[PDB]
Amino acid sequence: ADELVFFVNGKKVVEKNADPETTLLVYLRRKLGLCGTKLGCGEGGCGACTVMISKYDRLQNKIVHFSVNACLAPICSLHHVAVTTVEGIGNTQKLHPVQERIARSHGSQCGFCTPGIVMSMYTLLRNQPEPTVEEIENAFQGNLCRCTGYRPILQGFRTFAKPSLFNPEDFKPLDPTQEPIFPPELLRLKDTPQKKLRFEGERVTWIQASTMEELLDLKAQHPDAKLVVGNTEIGIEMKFKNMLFPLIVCPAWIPELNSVVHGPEGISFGASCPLSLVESVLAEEIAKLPEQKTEVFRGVMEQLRWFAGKQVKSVASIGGNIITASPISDLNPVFMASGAKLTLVSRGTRRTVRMDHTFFPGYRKTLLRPEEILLSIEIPYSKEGEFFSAFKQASRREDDIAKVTSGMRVLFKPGTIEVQELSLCFGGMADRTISALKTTPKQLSKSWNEELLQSVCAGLAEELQLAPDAPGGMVEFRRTLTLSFFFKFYLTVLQKLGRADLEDMCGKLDPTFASATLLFQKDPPANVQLFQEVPKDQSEEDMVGRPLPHLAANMQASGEAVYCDDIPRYENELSLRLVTSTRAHAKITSIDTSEAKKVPGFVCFLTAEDVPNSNATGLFNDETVFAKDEVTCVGHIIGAVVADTPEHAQRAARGVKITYEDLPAIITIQDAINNNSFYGSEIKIEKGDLKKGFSEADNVVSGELYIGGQEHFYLETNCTIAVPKGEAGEMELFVSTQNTMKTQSFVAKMLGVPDNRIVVRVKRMGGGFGGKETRSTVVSTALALAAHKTGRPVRCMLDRDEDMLITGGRHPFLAKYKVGFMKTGTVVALEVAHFSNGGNTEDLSRSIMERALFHMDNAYKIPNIRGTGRICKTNLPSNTAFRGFGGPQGMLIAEYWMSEVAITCGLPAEEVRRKNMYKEGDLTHFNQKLEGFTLPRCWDECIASSQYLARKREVEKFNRENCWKKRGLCIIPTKFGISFTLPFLNQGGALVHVYTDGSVLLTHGGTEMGQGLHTKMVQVASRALKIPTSKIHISETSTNTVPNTSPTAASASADLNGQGVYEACQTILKRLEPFKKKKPTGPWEAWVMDAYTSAVSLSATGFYKTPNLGYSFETNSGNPFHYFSYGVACSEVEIDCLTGDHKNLRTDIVMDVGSSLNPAIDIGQVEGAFVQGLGLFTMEELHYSPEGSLHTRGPSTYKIPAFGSIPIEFRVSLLRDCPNKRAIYASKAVGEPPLFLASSIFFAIKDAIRAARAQHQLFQLDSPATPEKIRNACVDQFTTLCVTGVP
Amino acid sequence: HFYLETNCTIAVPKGEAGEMELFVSTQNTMKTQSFVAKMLGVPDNRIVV
Ligand SMILES: Cc1cc2nc3c(=O)[nH]c(=O)nc-3n(C[C@H](O)[C@H](O)[C@H](O)COP(=O)(O)OP(=O)(O)OC[C@H]3O[C@@H](n4cnc5c(N)ncnc54)[C@H](O)[C@@H]3O)c2cc1C
Ligand SMILES: O=c1[nH]c(=O)c2[nH]c(=O)[nH]c2[nH]1
Ligand code: FES
Ligand code: FES
């Protein structure tokens, strides 16, 4: 047959024309309208699309439940399953316990990741109603959150395992009998045989094979037929590498491919067995068998720990990993090292082979005949005297791709330490899984000793060569890991020989080496959140300073919260796809749309010619709407395809052929320096006498620092819907933007209509972080144009790869410093030259450099100082605002030379920082006076609560007692100036209505992006009006309610909009006063109705401007900032000197947020900002080709912090008794200032590296301090052999 | 009356907090809002006409 039949939230779906290219995510959202399930990446790395599948498993004979990525699940694989989405488990009328707890524990900020995380936790509970803490963490290996810093999610969910921010005693208990029935029809159908099915789409035919005979017959007659089991590789090939397999066969149903059989030599798994099943089977075997027999099983398990997450492992098959034959397979090295036995079949044939180097003859090839399939793999029992290790080092532990991965096996002659067999196999060192076949033969009959160690390392260094040009780079690191992994195996086998009672023959392990061989384990988290209770006397209805949950948290947990692309399509709505430059700098010689036009549903291709009025856009009017004559970066938008559906728009975009003639490209900061290519002139702040300071200085240190940029990775990408109204040029846009005003202005200028025709509406964003302050408009303008031209609504949401390529990021910085200082650590002179890479338009680049210069002091009084900045103009995507806006880059440079001062003086870093710190009343280098300077309080509190001094003693002891792991510890302060650097942007407006039922509709210029701005404004309005928050509502942000709004940026939006709201409320109260006087007790509703029937206006605007701002670079005078934020963080790390991996052991933060408007939201901002900083300085790296093409375009390669990344002990205190009388209700801004405090981790790492270097001098550590950079800096016997040589 | 356009309403539920937006051929936005809000039992502030 040919109908596809499945269930969704208990409702039967019958699809009569299933297309094999249709994903479950698209089917749920676009066909069924269930938009709780989100698109975050389309490549399995984010979990935002997580749903649960239930089925009756014929082989285990029972109902099973597992999680999947809907973005990679073909609907054609789902016949006779039952899907559950976030909508299926609960809603705001009756929240599931999972939904309730994540909301109430402040686990949801922007909300875009919340459904997927809910479904991960929900699936766990359906499988294990009483999970462990570890099981809970493990449920989320495949889920990302960019806002929360993960802490609150795990803390809320810990309640399921085994003053306060939330109260777990009010959480309703779980009743598992109340979960949805497994669809009774499906149980009835488990008693009918499966028949073969065929589904035909636009391009692809899918056969769901029911028997082995059908599969073999098919592959005999049609060897082209592409096997799909999990689709976790094929889905990537199709979506990202434009590969089309017109015939697909799915064999998942076939019993022989799903069998597990225990044999004498090992356990045989059907090739279609999911990795989840391999894991559960091997775990039971390992628990029950002798250790001597499970060495290989434990190797596989160790790799599967770090293999994707639960969603991928539920459907990814063991045979699929093998045949995919990726160079970076984590399993094939283990299978090759252990000689695992593979059975291959075709119609009428059967052969068995042992995986060895022959199995993989070439890039992504096996020795399978085209008509052959893999039936089974036998993973072997280990023998007496046979030992096994497996290793993986990546950029991040959880859900990442191996840089190097390995399986290692040794067999000893019985009763000896003499080698009978030795196998070292590697991924990530060639275009296939390889064996070190030259090195290992030579060690046969040798004893396991130092000479074998040295011989194998010399062999590996020669045998596993990498060309300077090898894909992925990091050749020194990768080579170093092969030797380092072998060292670990060498030491591990010594220990294993030990436990076999042969310690006399091979050494005992030196106890300072034992930590080298430990398998990773973190430890259960311990968290502390400290904040100040409001006064005893405060009304219970006054929520200012109380930890009120985000007003939309319940709806976010339930998937009812509406983001742009969740808005239903009009019946006549069209889809837009942007077409971008594949050259960094080139002339457009021609455009050929001939193939585009043949795609069904194609409407038109828009280019510069179609722009009605002006093609000049961007904040400084130096950008094109659409390229004209030349392209100036890879990612430069040339045009936009308009089609009926996003699929057809994508296909048509591929048929737009562009011909180019290259022009000289300027890529790097050095390129731009050499070509004098800059945005405007040098910016400079200077004070005192540099000549004099350097002459007075006992010591002078010079150096440079490079700081990599950063992708925002808002979980919701850029999105616009433009709705033309058909009259008078009127158009309404629904946009994920922090900047309604510029969106409106830019659309209006492009169309050539007045601003009064264009309305921009923002309900909420799934994150922004500065990325949607300006760069959102490159989508909005294109969609507006399409809508105008067609007279039809048009929509575009970027795919993650498009968004990462087009919209830019944080500015990379290169700095050259020279610092003068006394032997006491007192700094007397500093000169810093900053360079940033701005890319191909000015955008905010100059203002970012100004803030970096304003923060080049960090917390330190420096009497003689000079900083300069230059913004490089390059052929790269334009970089823009990212939370911190140049602050983090400025301050990291300051801390970097400060670290070298302390080292050079031989004084404790904390004493050097402390004695250079500003004091109350000092002037900054830009002559602003520091009043209400709480930094010393933050410092003293942090030093004391973190027990910094005693912890220094423990770090020193650890470092003396361990050779191959080291700890480091650092405490870092910060000062962060609050207000836009452009004075007039420090303004905000509100509009309030009171309706005659007493209910209040509030709006302001600020946009909700997960920071809890609307929540705070409601708290504010409720205090100002003296009514419960329940009577006040904010529905959205719009240009036609509050005009001329600044972007929601500069951490200032609650300050500005708070005042605006407060003033609007004061006007209403003034009007109600006479009614209050006449009816002093009679309720609010009676005053309102009395005012109304007296014809008194119940609508008011409110407005605020920050007073007394305006700095001059010419005179180094005037205040850029209204006040400053302050905080301190102390962090401890433990590095792996052999791999570059590290654990974040503990972080303690004390943050001055004034009198917090909402301590729950403010702690959440501290934690979220801190963890983005942690990413910036230690994990997140973008790579570009020499020709300026971004390689890094999804979560597979761009590694943001994961649940497993965060400090194990994570303590956050908000400073007590520090009212800030010049912001709303004595609060301070919080969004950006905490981010730089994650430098504490960077400097703790730097400390640990210094200890490692003393073990095996102002060494260079650039940002980010990734495993590559950490490992490479830990110079030893192994790095020496890999960088050039001398054996 | 024989208005050439008869009575007509489009009601668009927003799925959040009882929020609803109505496109109406009416001389009386206020009473439309009131009457909808009262029928549903939500505050006036959720209902836009
Ligand atoms: C987010 C993410 C993270 C990942 N992480 C990792 C990781 O850490 N390590 C790792 O090694 N991989 C990783 N992968 C790769 C992928 O998950 C594995 O390769 C998985 O095992 C592929 O299995 P599948 O059943 O989904 O294969 P499919 O995609 O269905 O098929 C893959 C290939 O195998 C073929 N095939 C399948 N079964 C057979 C058979 N019996 N005989 C012949 N050919 C067959 C198909 O024709 C196809 O060529 C990751 C993928 C994703 C999306
Ligand atoms: O001074 C600032 N101006 C901005 O426009 C902005 N944007 C941002 O994210 N931070 C800041 N800071
Ligand atoms: S959208 Fe499916 S994993 Fe990201
Ligand atoms: S709350 Fe998790 S991505 Fe925003």
From Swiss-Prot, chain A:
Gene Ontology BP annotations: adenosine catabolic process; allantoin metabolic process; amide catabolic process; AMP catabolic process; cellular response to interleukin-1; cellular response to tumor necrosis factor; dAMP catabolic process; deoxyadenosine catabolic process
Residues noted as binding [2Fe-2S] cluster 1 in the record, renumbered to the chain: 41, 46, 49, 71
Compartments where located: Peroxisome; Cytoplasm; Secreted
Cited Gene3D superfamilies: 3.10.20.30, 3.30.465.10, [2Fe-2S]-binding domain (1.10.150.120), Aldehyde oxidase/xanthine dehydrogenase, a/b hammerhead (3.90.1170.50), Aldehyde oxidase/xanthine dehydrogenase, molybdopterin binding domain (3.30.365.10), CO dehydrogenase flavoprotein, C-terminal domain (3.30.390.50), Uridine Diphospho-n-acetylenolpyruvylglucosamine Reductase, domain 2 (3.30.43.10)
Residues bound to substrate: 773, 851, 885, 981
Residues binding Mo-molybdopterin: 738, 769, 883, 1050
Disulfide pattern: 506-963
Signal sequence range: none
Span of domain 2Fe-2S ferredoxin-type: 2-89
Activity regulation annotation text: Can be converted from the dehydrogenase form (D) to the oxidase form (O) irreversibly by proteolysis or reversibly through the oxidation of sulfhydryl groups.
Transmembrane segments: none
Subunit structure: Homodimer. Interacts with BTN1A1.
Database matches in NCBIfam families: xanthine_xdhA
Protein name according to UniProt: Xanthine dehydrogenase/oxidase
Curated annotation (Swiss-Prot), chain B:
Induction conditions: By interferon.
Signal peptide: none
Binding site for Mo-molybdopterin: 27
PTM annotation, UniProt: Subject to partial proteolysis; this alters the enzyme from the dehydrogenase form (D) to the oxidase form (O). Contains sulfhydryl groups that are easily oxidized (in vitro); this alters the enzyme from the dehydrogenase form (D) to the oxidase form (O).
Cellular compartment(s): Peroxisome; Cytoplasm; Secreted
Role description: Key enzyme in purine degradation. Catalyzes the oxidation of hypoxanthine to xanthine. Catalyzes the oxidation of xanthine to uric acid. Contributes to the generation of reactive oxygen species.
Subunit-level organization: Homodimer. Interacts with BTN1A1.
Family named by the database record: Belongs to the xanthine dehydrogenase family.
Protein name stated in the entry: Xanthine dehydrogenase/oxidase
Taxonomic source organism: Rattus norvegicus (Rat)
UniProt gene name: Xdh
Residue range from the parent sequence: 741 to 789 of 1331
